[PDB]
Amino acid sequence: METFLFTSESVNEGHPDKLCDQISDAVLDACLEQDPDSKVACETCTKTNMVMVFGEITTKATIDYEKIVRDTCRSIGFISDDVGLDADKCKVLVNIEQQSPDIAQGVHGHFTKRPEDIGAGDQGHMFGYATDETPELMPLSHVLATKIGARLTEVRKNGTCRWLRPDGKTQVTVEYYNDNGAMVPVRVHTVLISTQHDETVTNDEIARDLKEHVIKPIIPEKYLDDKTIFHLNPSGRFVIGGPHGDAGLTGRKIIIDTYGGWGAHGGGAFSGKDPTKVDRSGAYIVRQAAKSVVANGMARRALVQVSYAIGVPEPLSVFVDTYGTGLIPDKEILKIVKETFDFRPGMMTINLDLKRGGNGRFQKTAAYGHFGRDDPDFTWEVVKPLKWDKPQLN
Amino acid sequence: AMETFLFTSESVNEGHPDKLCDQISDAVLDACLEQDPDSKVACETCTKTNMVMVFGEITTKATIDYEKIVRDTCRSIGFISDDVGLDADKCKVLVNIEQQSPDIAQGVHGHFTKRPEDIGAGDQGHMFGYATDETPELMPLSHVLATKIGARLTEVRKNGTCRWLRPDGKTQVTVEYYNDNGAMVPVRVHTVLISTQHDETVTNDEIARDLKEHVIKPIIPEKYLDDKTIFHLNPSGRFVIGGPHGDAGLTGRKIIIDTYGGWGAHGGGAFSGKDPTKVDRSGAYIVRQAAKSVVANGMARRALVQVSYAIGVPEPLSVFVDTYGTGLIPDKEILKIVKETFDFRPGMMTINLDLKRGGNGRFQKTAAYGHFGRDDPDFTWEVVKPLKWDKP
Numbered sequence: 014m015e016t017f018l019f020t021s022e023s024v025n026e027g028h029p030d031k032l033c034d035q036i037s038d039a040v041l042d043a044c045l046e047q048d049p050d051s052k053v054a055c056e057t058c059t060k061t062n063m064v065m066v067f068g069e070i071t072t073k074a075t076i077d078y079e080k081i082v083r084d085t086c087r088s089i090g091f092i093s094d095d096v097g098l099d100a101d102k103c104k105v106l107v108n109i110e111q112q113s114p115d116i117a118q119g120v121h122g123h124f125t126k127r128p129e130d131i132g133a134g135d136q137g138h139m140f141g142y143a144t145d146e147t148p149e150l151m152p153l154s155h156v157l158a159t160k161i162g163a164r165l166t167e168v169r170k171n172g173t174c175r176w177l178r179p180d181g182k183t184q185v186t187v188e189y190y191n192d193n194g195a196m197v198p199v200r201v202h203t204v205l206i207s208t209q210h211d212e213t214v215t216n217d218e219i220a221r222d223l224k225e226h227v228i229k230p231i232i233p234e235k236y237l238d239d240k241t242i243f244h245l246n247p248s249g250r251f252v253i254g255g256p257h258g259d260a261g262l263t264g265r266k267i268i269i270d271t272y273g274g275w276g277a278h279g280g281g282a283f284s285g286k287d288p289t290k291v292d293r294s295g296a297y298i299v300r301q302a303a304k305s306v307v308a309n310g311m312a313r314r315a316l317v318q319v320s321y322a323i324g325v326p327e328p329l330s331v332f333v334d335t336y337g338t339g340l341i342p343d344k345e346i347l348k349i350v351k352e353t354f355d356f357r358p359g360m361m362t363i364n365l366d367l368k369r370g371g372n373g374r375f376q377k378t379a380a381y382g383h384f385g386r387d388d389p390d391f392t393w394e395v396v397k398p399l400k401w402d403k404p405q406l407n
Numbered sequence: 408a409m410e411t412f413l414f415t416s417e418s419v420n421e422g423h424p425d426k427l428c429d430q431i432s433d434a435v436l437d438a439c440l441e442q443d444p445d446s447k448v449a450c451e452t453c454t455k456t457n458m459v460m461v462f463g464e465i466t467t468k469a470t471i472d473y474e475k476i477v478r479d480t481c482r483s484i485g486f487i488s489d490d491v492g493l494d495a496d497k498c499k500v501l502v503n504i505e506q507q508s509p510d511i512a513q514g515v516h517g518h519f520t521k522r523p524e525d526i527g528a529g530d531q532g533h534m535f536g537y538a539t540d541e542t543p544e545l546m547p548l549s550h551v552l553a554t555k556i557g558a559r560l561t562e563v564r565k566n567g568t569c570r571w572l573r574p575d576g577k578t579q580v581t582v583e584y585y586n587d588n589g590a591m592v593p594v595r596v597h598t599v600l601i602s603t604q605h606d607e608t609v610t611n612d613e614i615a616r617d618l619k620e621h622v623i624k625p626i627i628p629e630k631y632l633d634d635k636t637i638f639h640l641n642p643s644g645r646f647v648i649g650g651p652h653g654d655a656g657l658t659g660r661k662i663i664i665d666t667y668g669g670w671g672a673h674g675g676g677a678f679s680g681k682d683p684t685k686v687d688r689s690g691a692y693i694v695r696q697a698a699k700s701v702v703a704n705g706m707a708r709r710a711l712v713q714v715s716y717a718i719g720v721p722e723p724l725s726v727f728v729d730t731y732g733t734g735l736i737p738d739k740e741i742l743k744i745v746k747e748t749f750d751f752r753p754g755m756m757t758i759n760l761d762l763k764r765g766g767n768g769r770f771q772k773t774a775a776y777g778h779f780g781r782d783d784p785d786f787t788w789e790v791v792k793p794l795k796w797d798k799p
């Protein structure tokens with residue numbers, strides 16, 4: 014058994030970049046709840062005692078940008094200068110304008126084009142990935158780092174670890190075997206957690222609590238052994254956190270948002286964008302495509318690329334690769350995927366019901382990742398039946 | 408019939424508002440390293456209509472005019488009027504820059520007391536380096552053509568060939584590829600796309616003519632072009648409003664365009680506005696050197712290298728090498744050689760690649776047209792290292 018090490022990280026809801034992603038998606042949800050046809054490109058940035066929302070929104074919604082910022086900051090736990098931002102005292106800056114008329118005519122003819130004619134809202138390329146190594150058909154390295162980060166938030170909010178503050182990051186090194194291009198986890202090599210904390214707790218109590226309350230409950234017993242390496246607040250002190258410790262921006266966690274370094278990324282951020290922004294509706298459809306290929310048993314792993322030009326509905330390219338694990342040739346998987354999914358932006362919006370905001374639909378997507386999640390609002394997680402002849406059947 | 412697949416990479420030029428932000432961020436870094444090479448810099452930039460903000464964490468002995476660095480960067484790019492999407496002299500410049508968290512500074516560098524081999528990673532994360540023999544710069548052709556078409560787009564605006572051009576432009580190339588036992592062999596350019604900002608003096612037929620004869624045809628090798636290549640030339644039909652005026656920009660929103668255009672992998676960290684204790688940068692720069700050295704020494708046709716860190720720990724938590732079945736020796740041996748040849752500790756990388764020297768736009772030059780595949784001697788991570796191996 015020749016093995017290799019692969020590492021992915023995560024950050025929880027209180028990381029200053031993820032805070033911005035969550036605020037950006039709070040603004041989106043708010044615009045859509047009132048005006049489903051909202052054009053939203055909402056960017057957020059944060060530093061000590063400052064939040065700025067900026068970019069382009071055309072909506073009929075009545076929005077107060079200041080209340081959405083201050084509410085999002087509050088629910089996450091940023092309620093004093095001690096935890097790294099005070100939702101009720103921080104400066105909130107707004108530089109939001111309507112979408113360029115030049116973009117609006119090409120994309121959606123100023124709200125006049127029919128679904129099937131809606132152009133991509135920008136150029137770019139997006140990838141979808143899926144792997145049979147976990148039930149959610151995601152990479153184990155990403156899934157553990159992410160589920161450890163969610164746990165880290167949960168034990169802060171349920172009172173299991175009262176010493177926790179909101180800002181935390183995780184990283185997991187998984188030791189893998191390649192089985193004919195499929196990825197088979199062997200064991201967890203290294204676990205890293207860095208978490209903000211108050212001045213009541215010793216580093217021995219942090220190490221103990223993280224192993225017992227956060228790590229052992231999330232990682233399957235069979236991947237943990239007495240050689241697994243643990244780094245637990247390795248910097249030795251994490252009291253100052255959130256924006257007070259580090260400025261955050263929307264769209265600076267795009268690998269954490271997706272597959273943790275597995276598959277590929279076309280580089281587009283998701284948060285604060287309505288679904289004419291193919292960066293988001295396009296990546297979601299290619300995840301649904303990649304997942305459907307693995308879930309139907311057509312392959313053990315699959316990577317799908319799509320690409321767009323602004324004002325053009327049809328994709329410029331589509332790629333399927335199954336890393337040698339496909340049970341039919343990759344070009345027939347490409348033909349089945351092209352027959353089965355509509356990559357036109359106006360169609361993707363409707364097929365995935367992405368014009369619904371409210372009940373934090375998108376805000377929920379803006380921490381703990383966009384993919385591998387079971388909430389029915391994650392409509393791109395629903396597997397589509399695919400038509401093919403399985404080698405094993407007559 | 409030869410089996411092929413389509414792979415698409417994009418680029419943006421120096422007037423893209425996200426890329427403007429990367430070049431401001433890295434202009435700040437330059438100014439800081441030119442006066443104080445031990446400068447700790449995490450300089451973030453964002454921009455919208457008539458507005459640039461610099462923010463984040465700088466500890467430097469340097470005496471810096473942030474406001475003049477912003478304006479001079481906006482000016483040399485060409486944002487000199489509201490008509491081209493930002494005026495370097497009119498716009499509001501906001502600054503929310505403060506000193507690095509002492510909790511980070513103690514753990515990372517012991518407030519400037521830790522020796523190089525003991526220097527902590529400034530953060531956790533992971534970082535990928537890639538190389539492929541398909542071009543002479545050992546970059547993927549999809550990425551190279553998109554990138555070099557965008558740099559030509561800027562060059563024909565500056566040199567006065569196409570006087571209707573404004574600063575903000577995007578490109579995208581779809582390449583048709585043959586898989587030759589894991590090695591990537593480019594067959595042809597399937598689709599070329601350009602969207603460029605433009606004044607009111609030019610017609611769409613003049614744009615499409617000029618973009619093909621002045622911009623595309625000079626850059627793309629003839630052997631890759633044919634009478635079936637698809638060309639999307641300003642497909643939105645109108646691009647007069649541009650720059651920050653048409654789209655908010657942010658530092659670190661072009662990390663794929665900064666790297667390998669969707670080939671290899673990305674750990675998700677941004678480069679621009681960071682000093683070298685930031686393993687996001689020094690980490691990705693050394694794994695590029697390692698990947699490039701494996702391919703350039705003839706050990707493989709393609710190579711991916713991952714490295715990972717924990718904050719405050721000098722040694723990486725993991726390394727992986729994969730050659731996609733092109734390695735002439737087993738990957739576990741290539742890993743052994745890379746570990747023996749490359750020092751991944753952040754204090755060591757900084758000195759070995761000379762990353763503590765800025766000025767003369769050392770980093771500002773990496774903040775557009777990509778950090779890899781360039782032969783400027785300032786790109787010390789492009790220098791190939793000899794590797795000791797026995798060719799089978």
Ligand SMILES: C[S@@+](CC[C@H](N)C(=O)[O-])C[C@H]1O[C@@H](n2cnc3c(N)ncnc32)[C@H](O)[C@@H]1O
Pocket residue numbers: 028029030180181182207208248249250251252253254255258259260448449464507508510511514529530718
């Ligand atoms: C280490 S900071 C990034 C570097 C920072 N811009 C600087 O000036 O060095 C990145 C993230 O690590 C976490 N972090 C902040 N302070 C930390 C500390 N003292 N120890 C460990 N992790 C910390 C927070 O999640 C923060 O957003």
Ligand SMILES: C[S@@+](CC[C@H](N)C(=O)[O-])C[C@H]1O[C@@H](n2cnc3c(N)ncnc32)[C@H](O)[C@@H]1O
Pocket residue numbers: 053054069112113115116119134135323423424425575576577602603643644645646647648649650653654655
């Ligand atoms: C189209 S904008 C992204 C979406 C935008 N935030 C919105 O409100 O729809 C992204 C980039 O496309 C380019 N762009 C801007 N205006 C354009 C136009 N009218 N036609 C084509 N490309 C344009 C610029 O490079 C800009 O930074």
Ligand SMILES: [K+]
Pocket residue numbers: 259260261449451463
């Ligand atoms: K930052």
Ligand SMILES: [K+]
Pocket residue numbers: 054056068654655656
């Ligand atoms: K934007």
Ligand SMILES: [Mg+2]
Pocket residue numbers: 030260261262265
């Ligand atoms: Mg960040």
Ligand SMILES: [Mg+2]
Pocket residue numbers: 135136137280281282292
């Ligand atoms: Mg983009």
Ligand SMILES: [Mg+2]
Pocket residue numbers: 425655656660
């Ligand atoms: Mg952008």
Ligand SMILES: [Mg+2]
Pocket residue numbers: 530531532675676677687
């Ligand atoms: Mg990072």
